[PDB]
Design brief:
about 375 residues, Rossmann fold, OB fold (Dihydrolipoamide Acetyltransferase, E2P), 10 helices, RNA-binding, tRNA/tmRNA (uracil-C(5))-methyltransferase, rRNA binding, S-adenosyl-L-methionine, EC 2.1.1.35
RNA sequence: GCUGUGUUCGAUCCACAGC
């Protein structure tokens, strides 16, 4: 679905809210499987590690707002308990540091927060105005004021064609995954899973579903390497594709930082990779490595809401094992009308990444009929 | 310019993609 998340969380309803998503997934999946899904719960609050807010000016008072889904009307928000405690503390600080500093305040229309379990933060202040050395001066005092307070925090100043990194635009996550810690660089404006608690569990579920697998793994559009770097434990080698250049950078750093040897990141789109597979095309960039030398019986896929397009649909059907994580079971099911013809559902999970909303995250392991 | 995207609401405003 497409619900909003409210300032007040009906935590008393968490369990009922979940139960309905469980029964919902079950109906949706019925045409393809009779499996009783595995179900992973979110903590009932402070689960969301990034939040964005429009800012509203009330004369000299200003404040973050969200918008009512149905009516479009403006809701003033002093806290946001769905967001991490750190995002909460930074919400108060930011309004404090800007309230009566007119260069920081003027034309300040939204604030983006990015937060980690490891306790780092990246706050972006967006403007309908040009930014200059005067802005940069005051903005520099605000960060030291914040740091002053023991907040590991960077600041990004944005306006049209403008991006002032106080120092930088990434932070480093530390996630405990199946015993071993795990570093993940995360870049502002590049996709990350918003629910870190749920993320740990998707990683872990993927790790269990691909246990004792023979050979190699192929991941498409792997972002900062999230799943690939974890799954590298279960596979002799990993080949992971990504086009977005800061994601590729982050993913590269993430291999180094985790001392991983068995994963190669390839800067390639799905279409011009499959060309390298079936058919040929002597690639400028692949030159370093030999595809025929690799043996991928498992393909991994985690698309946006829209899901797999028809081309990709066909492409993954090539493989004996498909691992598909979704943030929209509706499109997973569309996909599955096709995928079910060639594959059976081996495993099934719900992940409650978006509590108190209609959205559902989930996962499926499909093996060739 | 135009279209599309952004895995909470939300963005002809911030960003990205395609053209």
């Amino acid at each position: 679905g497409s619900h909003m998340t409210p300032e007040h969380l009906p935590t008393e309803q968490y369990e009922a809210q979940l139960a309905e998503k469980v029964v919902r997934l079950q109906s949706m999946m019925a045409p393809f499987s009779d499996l009783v899904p595995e179900v992973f719960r979110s903590p009932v609050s402070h689960y969301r590690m990034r939040a964005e807010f429009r800012i509203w000016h009330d004369g000299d008072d200003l404040y973050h707002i969200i918008f009512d889904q149905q009516t479009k009307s403006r809701i003033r928000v002093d806290s946001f308990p769905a967001a991490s405690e750190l995002i909460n503390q930074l919400m108060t600080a930011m309004i404090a540091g800007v309230r009566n500093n007119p260069v920081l305040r003027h034309k300040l229309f939204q604030i983006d927060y990015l937060t980690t379990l490891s306790n780092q933060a990246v706050v972006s202040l967006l403007y309908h105005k040009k930014l200059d050395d005067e802005w940069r001066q005051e903005a520099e005092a605000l960060r030291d004021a914040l740091r002053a307070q023991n907040l590991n925090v960077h600041l990004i100043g944005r306006a049209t064609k403008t991006k002032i990194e106080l120092d930088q635009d990434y932070i480093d996550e530390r996630l405990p995954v199946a015993g071993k810690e795990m570093i993940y660089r995360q870049v502002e404006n590049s996709f990350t899973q918003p629910n870190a608690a749920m993320n740990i569990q998707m990683l872990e579920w993927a790790l269990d579903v691909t246990k004792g697998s023979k050979g190699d793994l192929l991941e498409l559009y792997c972002g900062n390497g999230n799943f690939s770097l974890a799954l590298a434990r279960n596979f002799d080698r990993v080949l992971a594709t990504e086009i977005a250049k800061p994601s590729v950078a982050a993913a590269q750093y993430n291999i180094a930082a985790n001392h991983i040897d068995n994963v190669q990141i390839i800067r390639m789109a799905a279409e011009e990779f499959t060309q390298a597979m079936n058919g040929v095309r002597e690639f400028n960039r692949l030159q370093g490595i030999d595809l025929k030398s690799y043996q991928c019986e498992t393909i991994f896929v985690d698309p946006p809401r829209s899901g797999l397009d028809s081309e990709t649909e066909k492409m993954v059907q090539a493989y004996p094992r498909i691992l598909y994580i979704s943030c929209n079971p509706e499109t997973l099911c569309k996909n599955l009308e096709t995928l079910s013809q060639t594959h059976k559902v081996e495993r099934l999970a719900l992940f409650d990444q978006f509590p108190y909303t209609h959205h559902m995250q989930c996962g499926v392991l499909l093996t060739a009929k």
